[PDB]
Amino acid sequence: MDDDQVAFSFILDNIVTQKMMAVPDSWPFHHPVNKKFVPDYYKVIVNPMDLETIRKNISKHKYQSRESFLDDVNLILANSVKYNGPESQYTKTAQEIVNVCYQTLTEYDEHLTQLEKDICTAKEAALE
Numbered sequence: 084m085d086d087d088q089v090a091f092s093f094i095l096d097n098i099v100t101q102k103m104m105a106v107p108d109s110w111p112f113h114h115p116v117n118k119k120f121v122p123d124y125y126k127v128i129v130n131p132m133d134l135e136t137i138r139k140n141i142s143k144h145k146y147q148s149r150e151s152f153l154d155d156v157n158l159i160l161a162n163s164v165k166y167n168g169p170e171s172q173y174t175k176t177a178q179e180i181v182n183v184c185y186q187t188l189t190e191y192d193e194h195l196t197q198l199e200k201d202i203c204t205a206k207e208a209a210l211e
């Protein structure tokens with residue numbers, strides 16, 4: 084029944100919590116940048132993103148496929164390159180967050196593809 088979307092967001096949340104947030108020294112990417120510490124951030128980064136807000140989107144079942152999800156994770160890296168520069172050590176840990184994310188998704192590719200299909204058919208047929 085409704086379980087398909089909840090299972091999908093469940094697997095997403097855990098990838099974030101137990102594989103992505105586990106990257107060494109990734110804590111600065113766990114939460115929105117605190118303006119108190121980086122006063123220009125929200126002036127040079129126009130679309131902020133972080134793992135906690137991604138989790139909040141997961142709580143609200145924002146992502147129904149891998150792809151809108153990867154959009155937001157990739158954004159975290161895109162944002163680090165603009166603020167910190169392409170070969171900053173902070174950009175490099177964001178890179179690895181992006182990497183372990185893709186690594187996990189392909190591990191569960193066939194499993195997630197099933198979930199993804201059932202959700203789109205439900206959606207597209209809910210409009211009857």
Ligand SMILES: CC(C)Oc1cc(C(=O)NC2CCN(C)CC2)ccc1Nc1ccc2c(n1)N(C1CCCC1)[C@H](C)C(=O)N2C
Pocket residue numbers: 111112116117120121124163166167173
């Ligand atoms: C400890 C210190 C080093 O950092 C922070 C500390 C704190 C801190 O203690 N907060 C607590 C909250 C609780 N209360 C009770 C006490 C205070 C917050 C942010 C720090 N820095 C930071 C964060 C993110 C980035 C970030 N820095 N950076 C780095 C690149 C250049 C600046 C540093 C950029 C903006 C970047 O992309 N990102 C994502």
